[PDB]
Design a protein around this nucleic acid. Structure first.
Ligand SMILES: [K+]
Ligand SMILES: [Mg+2]
Ligand SMILES: [Mg+2]
Ligand SMILES: [Mg+2]
Ligand SMILES: [Mg+2]
Ligand SMILES: [Zn+2]
Lengths: 99, 42, 38, 69, 177, 133, 71, 162
RNA sequence: CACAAACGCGUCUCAGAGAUAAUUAAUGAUUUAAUCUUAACCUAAUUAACUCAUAAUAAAUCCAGCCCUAGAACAGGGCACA
């Protein structure tokens, strides 16, 4: 009985572990986890938390670029709000729709 | 005054030898980032 | 003193004053008017 | 990506830019996994064994085309 | 990194010493970052089973600044076990007796409540003032920033700043201050 | 060649002794009252070692005083070796005294019952009579 | 970067007791009891003292002789 | 500013008042049509206990506060300024605005405990021996409710009771 | 009290500093008066707790045997002149 219930919790526990590693590797660059995720999705980069944790440990340079990408995207969002809202979408904020 | 290799270690003497190991691996073109061995049909 | 809930001035010489976080009715002519909020 | 560069997709990279090939090795079955449900003092036990078919892949080469706008 | 297998593992799981000043810093904000470093929640290689953990050195713990009236309202209570041995000590009284007790108790309550809390508390070094042994000083790596920006008093403002800030009102000439 | 002697200062503490309890005697005062006195004899008292102020307590220095002479053949190897360097026979009981820096005595200096002058009030510390379970 | 502290134990590593007799490799030992030994190691490695004691035969025997090894 | 001078010259006492030149208001305020000084310079809902440069212009040389009639502040802002000055003194700022007493500085006491955002006074709060569970919790006040209208750049409301 | 001891009915000894609650008073502003102040600075008179000064403890690694005012066992103190 404990085998099956833990098997259900195995997926939850590993997901929690990945977020801690992503948060730890994101705070190292001065960017919080909530800001690193939403501002990466706005760039249409669909990477799950499993591979982001792996990039954090074994790819220190690449994870910096993703962190650098998120910070640049976030700083563009604030500029639009600060303006009149009629600013053309940022050079990184442009949405590309495949159809 | 140009960095070519860097190695960690328990002590300075052990770390310094590891620095030479990294330098030799880079000079001999036998690093861990090297192009993987080609196995395609010739 | 007289520990009471609501403070009222029994004579015109009673003066309110807030000390130690509570309101005290201090009177000079009649010491029996001294009251203390609980 | 490599040591000195990294390419991001939105959300996918074109087939003309990077080619990845893999070779199938083993088509096997997983070890017996046990799934049991039990409820107290109601006399309800259900035991079933799951054997999930599995496939092992070997990734051989990853190539990057030099075509990039 | 082209390191050998042994030195590569040693470098990744290295212990790092941190320095954290405490001059006019609340213990709660001091303990929040200190708890993370002790656990290892800043390393992307973190895992509870692994022994990852970093030493933290906190100096000037006599000059902590409790926010609000917590110096007289917050109390620390303990029981010696014997009947009639229930002692409640105000925050001000405890800090006057044991200078590092306020910070140590704050961290001791924020770490995870497993059996590793005793192990990871041994790596925490507290000093009432800037009197650190030379052995501890040589182990440090970097200093963590202060979590609270210390406001400056009136006498610390330069005369250039005083003249720059506008005079809001014009007092009458006949008033006696 | 003893250590230098300093004049008395307020708040200074002296060095005690180790004595042997003989028995009790009755004693009478000039007002007719009767008092009971306990005979404490000092047999062999020598200061053994001196501990610096910062190595014992941080406030007052510590002076070590030994008891009466005992046989060499029933003491530990370290205990016999310690007394050999000083040059004294082994002692029975060893106690630690808290002494200020202005009343330090060179180790190996004998002490006598004249250390206490009549009229003074003194304390006594010893193991009481054990009555078992 | 700072220069390598090469001669830190320069005299400690190689000390000649005398120039008339050969050097002696006499590693003096105290062999402290289990009590003082554990508290010496715990202070050395900045750990507690509860993990330096051994365990019973039951826990020792159930450890896997050949743990799986990756890489 | 006017000051009073009392002189004793051989069983004769002379008391006279002398006028000292007073600094004036800055020439150009951003909002000339304002009424009270605080909202005339667009300082409404933008100052806190830290702003010593503002709170040092509505206080006496010995730590007291000037009356609302002289300054001209509105009642709503005057109470907020009064609260900030009280919090500033307890926080340790404004060290030159204490009265001078040569006899009392020599007998030092227990070192000052650093504090900030103290709503009450140090001598009028009693320890919370029986705190209580989460459904009836005695919360230690921090800051004052008079400063809950200040602008919040983060957007989260200020936590006054914690 | 028919043991060389135990025992009471007998004899001996029993402490300084900080710190506080209600309350009382000085200086003083919002309120140029006054006003002990969940106004500031300094300062005064003041319950019991409580905390501490201080005192007790202190030597790593003779120990078969015998003795002991040490003791259930195990430990502990003596065994050179006695
Ligand atoms: K008043
Ligand atoms: Mg007995
Ligand atoms: Mg007045
Ligand atoms: Mg004590
Ligand atoms: Mg013995
Ligand atoms: Zn009245």
């Amino acid at each position: 009985v404990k085998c099956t219930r833990a098997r259900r919790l195995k997926k939850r526990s590993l997901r929690t572990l990945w977020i801690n590693r992503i948060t730890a590797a994101s705070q190292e660059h001065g960017l919080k986890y909530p800001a690193f995720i939403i501002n990466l999705i706005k760039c249409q980069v669909e990477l799950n938390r499993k591979v982001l944790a792996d990039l954090a440990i074994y790819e220190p340079k690449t994870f910096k670029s993703l962190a650098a990408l998120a910070k640049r995207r976030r700083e563009e969002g604030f500029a639009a709000a600060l303006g009149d809202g009629k600013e053309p979408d940022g050079i990184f904020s442009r949405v590309v729709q495949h159809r | 005054r140009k960095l070519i290799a860097e190695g960690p270690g328990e002590t300075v003497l052990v770390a310094e030898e590891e620095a030479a190991r990294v330098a030799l691996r880079k000079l001999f073109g036998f690093t861990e980032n090297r192009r993987p061995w080609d196995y395609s049909k010739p | 003193f007289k520990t009471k809930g609501v403070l009222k001035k029994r004579c015109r010489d009673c003066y309110l004053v807030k000390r130690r976080g509570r309101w005290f009715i201090y009177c000079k002519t009649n010491p029996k008017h001294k009251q203390r909020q609980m | 990506g490599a040591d000195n560069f990294t390419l991001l997709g939105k959300p996918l990279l074109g087939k003309e830019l990077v080619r990845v090939e893999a070779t199938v090795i083993e088509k096997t079955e997983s070890w017996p996994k046990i799934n049991m449900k039990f409820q107290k003092r109601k006399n309800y036990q259900r035991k079933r064994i799951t054997v999930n078919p599995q496939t092992v892949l070997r990734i051989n080469s990853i190539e990057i085309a030099p075509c990039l706008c | 990194s082209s390191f050998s297998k042994a030195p590569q593992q040693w470098a990744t799981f290295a212990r790092v010493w941190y320095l954290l000043d405490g001059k006019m810093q609340p213990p709660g904000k001091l303990a929040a970052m200190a708890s993370v470093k002790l656990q290892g929640l800043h390393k992307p290689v973190y895992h509870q089973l692994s022994d990852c953990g970093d030493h933290v050195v906190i100096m000037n713990t006599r000059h902590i600044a409790f926010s609000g009236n917590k110096w007289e309202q917050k109390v620390y209570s303990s029981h010696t076990g014997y009947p009639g041995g229930f002692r409640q000590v105000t925050a001000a009284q405890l800090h006057q007796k044991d200078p590092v007790a306020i910070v140590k108790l704050a961290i001791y309550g924020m770490l995870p409540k497993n059996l590793h809390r005793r192990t990871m508390m041994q790596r925490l070094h507290l000093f009432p003032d800037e009197d650190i042994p030379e052995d501890i000083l040589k182990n440090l790596v970097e200093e963590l920033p202060q979590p609270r920006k210390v406001p400056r008093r009136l006498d610390e403002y330069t005369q250039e700043e005083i003249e720059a800030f506008p005079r809001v009102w014009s007092p009458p000439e006949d008033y006696r201050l | 060649e003893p250590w230098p002697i300093h004049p008395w200062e307020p708040g200074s503490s002296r060095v005690g002794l180790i004595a042997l309890k003989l028995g009790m005697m009755p004693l009478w005062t000039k007002d007719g009252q009767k008092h009971v006195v306990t005979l404490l004899q000092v047999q062999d008292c020598h200061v053994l070692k001196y501990t610096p102020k910062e190595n014992h307590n941080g406030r007052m220095a510590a002076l070590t005083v030994g008891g009466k002479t005992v046989s060499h053949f029933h003491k530990s190897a370290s205990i016999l070796e310690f007394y050999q360097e000083l040059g004294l026979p082994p002692k029975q009981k060893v106690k630690i005294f808290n002494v200020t820096e202005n009343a330090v005595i060179k180790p190996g200096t004998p002490l006598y019952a004249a250390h206490f002058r009549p009229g003074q009030y003194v304390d006594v510390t010893a193991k009481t009579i054990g009555k078992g379970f | 970067t700072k220069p390598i502290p090469r001669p830190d134990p320069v005299h400690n590593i190689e000390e000649t007791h005398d120039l008339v007799l050969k050097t002696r490799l006499e590693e003096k030992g105290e062999h402290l009891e289990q009590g003082p030994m554990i508290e010496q190691l715990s202070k050395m490695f900045f750990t507690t003292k509860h993990r330096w004691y051994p365990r019973g035969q039951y826990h020792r025997r159930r450890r896997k002789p050949n743990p799986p090894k990756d890489r | 500013f006017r000051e009073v001078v009392e002189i004793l010259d051989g069983k004769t006492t002379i008391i006279e008042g002398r006028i000292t030149e007073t600094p004036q208001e800055s020439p150009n305020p951003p909002n000339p049509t304002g009424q009270c000084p605080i909202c005339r310079w667009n300082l409404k809902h933008k100052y806190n206990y830290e702003d010593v440069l503002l709170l040092s212009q509505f206080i006496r040389p010995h730590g007291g506060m000037l009356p609302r009639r002289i300054t001209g502040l509105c009642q709503e802002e005057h109470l907020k300024i009064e609260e900030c000055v009280k919090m500033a003194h307890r926080a340790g700022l404004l060290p030159n605005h204490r009265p001078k007493l040569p006899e009392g500085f020599v007998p030092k006491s227990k070192p000052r405990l650093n504090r900030y955002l103290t709503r009450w006074s140090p001598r009028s709060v009693k320890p919370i021996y029986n705190k209580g569970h989460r459904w009836n919790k005695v919360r230690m006040p921090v800051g004052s409710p008079l400063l809950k209208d200040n602008v919040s750049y983060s957007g989260r409301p200020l936590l006054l009771y914690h």
